[model samples]
Each structure stands twice: as structure tokens, then as C-alpha cells.
Target chain A: ACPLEKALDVMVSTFHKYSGKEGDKFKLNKSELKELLTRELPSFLGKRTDEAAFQKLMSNLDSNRDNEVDFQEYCVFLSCIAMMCNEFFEGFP
Target chain B: ACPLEKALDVMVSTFHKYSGKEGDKFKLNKSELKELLTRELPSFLGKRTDEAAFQKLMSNLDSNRDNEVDFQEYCVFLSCIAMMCNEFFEGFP
Candidate 1:
């Protein structure tokens, strides 16, 4: 079970990722995603995007969407490209 | 307290339920709600409904909304109408 908000976002995003394309670097946009990760995931604890430099990650993860990574959309996006990431996206509570 | 996904629904619905009119049938329409319960709940596990049964239930439960039941809206609708039912609605995890 994931956090309600997190899980909601994941379900929506997960659906998007799988239903569309292959090699779609499924995840949120880097800059925007970094903000979510920083806030939601403690793993990036104390690591701000400005200092950590999330541009590379942004380029790596943000594929189909133009820029903003609606986490919900990102969850669905990861389902196709990477099974593990997709599952990880849902495993939060 | 409930199944993770279910709890999420409750939170959203509960937010709406208490925020509006009092004694306003704070649960989904009888028919639509019945569907969700049958689908999601093991309690009253085997109850079933048909056109006639559904119409009657709808009459009692449906207020502003029309023939169809968008469960989400029904959920929000319930937020205001029935207190005991609302308690039960949210108590399901």
C-alpha cells in the first residue's frame, strides 16, 4: 500500500507510461520530479535539486511529457519501460 | 484502518461529505453504492440488484445527479447527507 496521494499519482502515471510507447523514459521530468522526490521521498533528504543538479536525471526520466512531470502521469509512464520502477512507484504508503 | 486504496477513497469522500448540507444522504446512491459494495465489500457479500431494484434504490439515494452514477460524485454527495452511513462508509479501509 502506498500513501494515498502517492499511490493515486502512481496509478495514473503508471497507466500512461504503459499504454503509449516503448523506450519512453518513464518517470517525471527532472526538475519538477526532483521537487516531488525531495518532498515526498526522504532518500533525497537534505539534497536540494539546485545543489544536487537534477538536470541529468530530468533528461533521463522525462520522455513523453513536454516538461512538467505530473507524478500521477509518471507512475503510469514507468509501467512499460521499467517494471521495477513502476512497481517501486506503487510500493509507497 | 482500511484497505489502503479504500482509505484513500474515504478521505476524499469524507472531505466532501462533512463539508456540505446536513442529513443529505451522505453515501452514494443506493444502486451505485450497491455496485461498489458488491464489487469492493465482502459484507452483504452476495446481495444483488437488477433494473427494478436499482431504480428504487436510485430514487432514495439519487438527489441532484441523474440516471447514471459516477461513483466519485456519489461519494462526494454522501459526504453531506448521512452521518451514520458516512461513518460506515469511511470505516471501510
Candidate 2:
């Protein structure tokens, strides 16, 4: 498989690894989301590690108003971050 | 860096690998997008190798109406596919 194909598997496995820790077992509760972000995306969310920031992120990610981040929402969140990163590296060396 | 972080780097590098082929170095023209999909996402798009499918996909992905897919649009496209894959594996053993 290509790196992107393997990356897709990583995305799914990573989500389930954290999401399976508690209730629902398929969606990310607040703490699960926090842990996933802090561990998997430390550089992106390291600066805004606070209750208020997490609350905002939670609200934004819970697009279906379910109070939890499902796999679909998680994919969108990653996509947004990837897009931002792409912009930052658009003119790279 | 974590696997997810490394995946981000892979995504960016993969985009540049094909997007730099010709014309508007930061975007993927039809041929470029087709090559990227066929090479990197063969499983996701293997069944839709005809021109019509590619045209429809190109239309859907060219969100800026520029007839080319920029990195943002490409990320969204990948996100949608990832979401579909996630749904497919939501109930795995």
C-alpha cells in the first residue's frame, strides 16, 4: 500500500485506540479527544492546552451536536489541520 | 514525531510529488490528480477507471471552480474518502 493508504489505516487505528477507552467505545468523549490531540498532535495543540481551548475544540469538532467526536468529525478535524499545514508549507524549500 | 504527525508530512510530500508535474505547481491538474489517485489510492478508485468517473470526481473536488484541485480541496477529498473507510470499519472485530 502507498503511504497515504497506510496513513488512512493509521488514522482509523489511532482513533479507535483512544476512543475505545471508555463509554460508547466508538466516539471520542472530551477526555479521549484531549488525549488524542495532546499525544498525536502535540505540536498543533500544545500551545492551547487549557479547558477553554479544549471546550472550543470540542464544540467545533462535535459537528452533529452529539457532545462527542465521531470518526467522521475526526476526519474533518484532521483535514482542516492538514490544510492549514499545507498552506504553511506551500513554498517550502 | 508520532505516526499521525509523520502521516501529515507524507500527505504534504505526496501532494507535491504529483502536483509539481506541470502548470500551476501548487495545484493538481486532471492528469496529475488522476495519476495521484491511481498510484496512491488504487483501492479506493480502482473500480472507477473510466473518464466519466474521473470527470465527475474532478468536478466535485474543484471546489474553487478553477478546474484544478489545490491542496485544501485535495485534503477535503481525502477526508471524505477516509470518512467512508472509517464507516466501513466501524464494526470490525
Candidate 3:
């Protein structure tokens, strides 16, 4: 769990846009990562994904291809992930 | 990695419905000491999961409160995972 924990820390750290520890804006850097992909990669395998999709994909991918999405594969549809996460926090409802 | 791998074994074992010996149905079964929301928890969550809505929900839920669904919350939507996995593997195309 340590390795995975360590990896999660890195992902979360970058994802939420929180640098320099406890005092930072929680901007969801992960979503940002996904957003960049929409304008970037073409033919990304996974769908644009929303919060739910993120959960499911993560559950699948995180288990080292067992539960959660891997960093590399996730990076594949980075743009889409970004767009969805963006829509979410934007109060798009 | 070992712990994650171990967890995976249990998840997959239940997922595939592997019981006892070396052969069984591929099902998903995991309990927080007693198997709560797993393949059976679809009670009401099922028919309600609209494609568009679900994507968003999952992304938000699974992300370690950041960008990946944790193991426990995942168990909450266990049935959904089974059905989805079934669809993805059934090759509906």
C-alpha cells in the first residue's frame, strides 16, 4: 500500500494544484490534466468521463489495472478527464 | 504493491465468482468485514444511472477525494461495476 499510497500522493498533489503543502488552492490539478487532453490527444480510448466515470475508472485503474486507471493510460484521455472535472467544479448542473 | 496485489486477488476472485477451487463464475465480491455494497447493492442505484450522469458522478467519487476512487467508496457502487464490466466484456458490438 505504501507504493500505491506514495503514487496517490503524487497524483493528488499534482491534481489538486496544491503545491508547497497545506496552504494552496484546491483546483483539482487532475481535472486540469484531463482537460489538456481534450485539445491535445486524438482517439483517446476512454470517454470524456465525469465525476462518476472518474470514480469507476479509478476503481478499475487503481488496482494496477485491476481497479483504478494507471497514470499512463489515464494520461491517454487526459483532455477528456479535464473537461469533465472542469464541468463539475464549474457548477455546470 | 503487495497489499494492492493481495486486495486485487480478493476482488478479482469474487468478481469472477471464483470459489473454492480453480474454476467458477467471474463475479465481484468484497465486504468490509461482511460484504455490504457489492454485486448485490444494485438494489436501486442500477436503473437510475443515466449514462451522462454516471460518468460525472464516478469521476468525483473515486478520486481519493482527489482523482481516483478509493477502495471503500468503490464498494458502494459495486453492482454498477459488475454490470459495466459485464457489458464491456460481453462485446456488445
Q: TM-score, each model?
A: 0.27, 0.86, 0.22
Query: DockQ score for model 3, please?
Result: 0.02
Q: What TM-score, to 2 decimals, does candidate 1 have?
A: 0.27
Q: Superposing all C-alpha atoms, what RMSD in Å does each candidate have to the true structure?
A: 16.1, 2.8, 18.2
Error (Å) of candidate 3 at residue B13 is 13
Using lDDT as the measure, the top candidate is: 2
TM-score of chain A of each: 0.37, 0.89, 0.26
Question: Which tens-of-lDDT digit does each residue in B1-93 have in candidate 2?
Answer: 699988877887799899989998899999999999999988879865888889999999998898999998888887787777777667644
Candidate 3 structure quality by residue, lDDT tens digits, B14-58: 322322223211121222211222232334245545546554665
**Global lDDT for candidate 2?**
0.87
In terms of DockQ, the best-performing candidate is 2
Candidate lDDT scores, in order, read: 0.40, 0.87, 0.35
The DockQ-derived docking category for candidate 2 is medium
Ranking by lDDT: 2, 1, 3
- lDDT tens digits by residue: candidate 2, A1-93: 589888878877899899989998889999999999999999888787989999999989998998999988888888887877777667644
lDDT tens digits, residue span B5-55, model 1: 343344344323432333323334444455444544323234654668656
